[PDB]
Amino acid sequence: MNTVPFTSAPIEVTIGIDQYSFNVKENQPFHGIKDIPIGHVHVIHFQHADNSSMRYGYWFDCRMGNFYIQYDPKDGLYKMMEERDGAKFENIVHNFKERQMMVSYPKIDEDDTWYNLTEFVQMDKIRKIVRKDENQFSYVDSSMTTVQENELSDPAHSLNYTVINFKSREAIRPGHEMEDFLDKSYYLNTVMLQGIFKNSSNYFGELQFAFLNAMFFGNYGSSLQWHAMIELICSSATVPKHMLDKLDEILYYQIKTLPEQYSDILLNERVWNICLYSSFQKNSLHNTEKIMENKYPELL
Amino acid sequence: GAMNSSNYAELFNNDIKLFVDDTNVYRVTVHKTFEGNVATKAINGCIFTLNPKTGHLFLKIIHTSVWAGQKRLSQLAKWKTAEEVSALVRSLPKEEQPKQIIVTRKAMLDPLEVHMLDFPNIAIRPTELRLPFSAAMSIDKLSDVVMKATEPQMVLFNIYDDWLDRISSYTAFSRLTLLLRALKTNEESAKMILLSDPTITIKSYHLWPSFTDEQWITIESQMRDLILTEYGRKYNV
């Protein structure tokens, strides 16, 4: 169990850790988050009380280093930093725990939600989507645009998700125009799985990371990417059976976790109705279809 | 974006463009089987691809053999249309290729877009105009060449005959669409109008009769009369 200490909390802020969240008052004696489960990536995220715009945060894995948060009054945000002196870090954390100035990561034992949302998500892949190679952790916020959005403007601050485009030469083989447009199996299995991602685990990891950035930061390009990756699978007649069963589980937990009040913006009516009722895979997503119909029947 | 009454003179500027109409590509007769079920029999069809500025018509005849052993033919017909239009463009010299292709039905947009990915600079556009190109098979010489075809074939026409020697392309297109709208609303009456006087003939190299300017005004008036009557009939007004 690892710890992310805070130097201080100089501005009033709602702090998220994974799917949990806590309100911290201005200059409240808050010094961080303890008992963070080892073995998973995590995200710590922020919404200032005075600017409910710009949700922002940091993806990290405590196995990769000792990380802490410190407010920067010049740039006006809570920044993640790495402490390279392990003795200084242990000593700081031990004092803060002894003074009981940390919140405990509040996981219920039965609860597998976070594992189920991050099963295929790896820090090393996050860091290739979010390029800032001098840090071990990755910053994301509500406004960052994706590489594909930039093609339709600052490249250093972009989300380099894999570009998917159903009306593209990459997606359509000369002479198989109609076949490849109506059945995307070629594009899924040869171009994306075999060619770009190498395996379905990496595909699922990027899909899961895109969803989580959409949910936690309202990142619109991430929502586009999540739906595109779902639609590519649902629109393929030929999908490995284990991939479909895993996709059903992935989406089920994403739909289960989504705020009820955010379904209007975070769910694309067309994609979901196509995927669940029109597509090749309309009969392959039993758990997802059941929770969608009981939780968001209006959308459908 | 979409083509409508507001940007109508764009059709007659000097950027090459084509209309593509697919309404006569997949044609069938519906009939009863011996067992009393219903079946279709396909008949020859055609793609109607028209340069509205010049009158040049690229009539690709669609022989029924292209449907043999195929499923979902109304869907295939859209992709076959797009394949053939794309092949036509590729066959034209670069300076003859269109800058825009306007499809008369929105369901042709994605098929044509996908087939034309190699041509990112050719704009594929829908239209809000209700153009009467489906009536092209009411033009006797076009109907005749489609029904006689024993194999796939492209036949080139000028759908304006020699009109551009005397009128502008805006006016020629207006006359064409008036003639076709008439043929579409009441083919028999429209065809009576055009041929009643046996001293006006169709030249061997033309599609329509050799009317003088004055006779075209009369003809055009008779076509507008036809269309309005039918409209009162249709709608009891």
Instruction: Write out the H or E segment, with its range, that includes residue A200.
Output: helix A200-217
The residue written with tokens 């159903």 in the block is A166
HSE value, Cβ hemisphere, 13 Å, CA-based, for A261: 0
DSSP annotation of A145 reads: P
Residues of A in contact with B111 (CB under 8 A): 177-178, 181
Contact B81, B20 (CB under 8 A): yes
Write down all domains in chain A, each with its CATH number in brackets: 1-143 (2.60.34.20), 144-300 (1.25.40.550)
Testing the interface with A: which of B74, B117, B124 to mutate, by most A Cβ within 10 A? B117
All residues at 6 or more sequence positions from B222 whose CB lies less than 8 Å from its CB, including other chains:
B193
Helices A220-234 + A241-257 axis angle, to 10: 150
The residue of chain A nearest to residue B76, with distances taken between CA atoms, is: A178
SS3 A103: strand
| Residue B28, phi-psi category: left (phi > 0), alpha (psi -120 to 50), beta (remainder) | beta
DSSP state of B177: H
Please judge whether A178 and B110 are an interchain contact, meaning their C-beta atoms are less than 8 angstroms apart. no
Beta-carbon contacts of A222 under 8 Å, excluding residues fewer than 6 positions away, are A146, A159, A161, A210, A211, A213, A214
Yes or no: say if B52 and B135 are a contact pair by the CB < 8 Å rule. Answer: no
Phi-psi region of B183 (alpha: psi -120 to 50; beta: other; left: phi over 0): alpha
β-bridge pairing B27-32 and B17-21: unpaired
- Structure token pair of residue B215: 């006779």
CA dihedral A237, A239, A245, A249 (to 10 degrees): -80
Question: Under an 8 A CB cutoff, do A178 and B111 touch?
Answer: yes
Per-residue burial over A277-298, b if 16 or more Cβ lie within 10 Å, else e, is eebbbeebbebbbebbeeebee
Give B44: exposed, middle or buried? Use CB within 10 Å, 0-12, 13-18, 19+. Answer: buried
B76, B83, B114 ranked by CB distance to A172: nearest: B114
Angle of helix A200-217 versus helix A220-234 axis, rounded to 10:
140
A205: buried, middle or exposed (CB in 10 Å: 19+, 13-18, 0-12)? buried
Handedness of CA B7, B10, B16, B20 (dihedral sign): positive
CA distance A205 to A246: 12
Biggest distance spanned by C-alpha atoms of chain A: 70
Hey, which bits of A127-243 come out as E strands?
A: 138-141
b/e A245-254 (16+ beta carbons within 10 angstroms → b): ebbbbbbbbb
Tell me if B117 and A181 make a contact (CB, 8 A cut-off).
no
Q: Residue B42 in contact with residue B28, Cβ under 8 Å?
A: yes
The residue ranges of DSSP E strands in chain A, in sequence order, are 2-5, 13-17, 20-24, 32-36, 42-48, 51-60, 67-72, 77-82, 103-104, 138-141
**Measured between alpha carbons, how far is A216 from A59 in angstroms, rounded to an integer?**
11
| CB A66, CB A86: distance < 8 Å | yes
Record: contact A168-B117, CB cut-off 8 A: yes
Question: Which residues of B fall within a CB distance of 8 Å from A168?
Answer: 117
CB–CB contact A172 B83 (8 Å): no
For B85, the 3-state DSSP assignment is helix
Specify the residue for token string 């239009």: B85
What is chain A's alpha carbon radius of gyration, rounded to the nearest angstrom? 21
Record the tokens describing residue B58, joined without a space. 């690229």
Resolution value (Å, 1 decimal)? 1.6
Identity of the residue numbered B148: K
Which residues in chain A have their CB less than 8 angstroms from residue B82's CB? 177
Residues with Cβ within 8 Å of B8's Cβ and at least 6 positions away in sequence, in order, are none
Residue range(s) of every CATH 1.20.80.40 domain in chain B: 164-237
d(CA A58, CA A154): 20
CA distance A151 to chain B (A): 15
Partner residue opposite B79 with nearest CB, options A168, A169, A178: A178
Both tokens of residue B60?
Answer: 């690709």
Burial class (CB in 10 A: 0-12, 13-18, 19+), B13: exposed
Asked if B114 and A169 come within 8 Å (Cβ–Cβ), the reply is no
Any B CB within 8 A of A167 CB: yes
Reading the block at residue A285, the tokens are 């997503």
Using a CB-CB cut-off of 8 Å, the residues of chain B touching A151 are none
In the numeric block, which tokens belong to residue A71? 């407010």
**Are the C-beta atoms of B123 and B102 separated by less than 8 Å?**
no
Closest-CA residue of A relative to B110 is A167
Backbone angles phi, psi at B37, to 5 degrees: -85, 180
Any residues with CB less than 8 A from the CB of B43 and at least 6 apart, and which? B27, B28, B29, B64, B147
* Chain B contact set for A178 (CB, 8 A): 76, 79, 111, 114
CATH of B9-163, one of 3.30.420.230, 3.40.640.10, 2.120.10.60, 1.10.645.10: 3.30.420.230
DSSP-derived 3-state class of residue B25: coil
Q: What one-letter code names the amino acid at A28?
A: Q
Determine which of A151, A167, A170, A178 to mutate to test the interface with B (most B C-beta atoms within 10 Å): A178
Structure tokens at A67: 């990380």
Two structure tokens written together for B52 = 């509205």
Distance from CA of A152 to the nearest CA of B (A): 14
A152 touches chain B (CB under 8 A): no
Q: Which helix (H) or strand (E) segment is B101 a member of?
A: strand B100-103
Please state, as a whole number, how many other Cβ atoms lie within 10 Å of the Cβ of residue A106: 13
The secondary structure element, H or E, covering residue A90 is helix A86-98
Angle at A217 between CA A212 and CA A222, to 5 degrees: 55
| Chain centroid, CA A124 distance in Å | 14
**Smallest Cα distance from B115 to chain A, Å:** 6
- CATH code: domain B164-237 is 1.20.80.40
Q: Say yes or no: A168 contacts chain B, CB-CB below 8 A.
A: yes
**Residue from A232, A18, A212 nearest A106 by CA:** A18
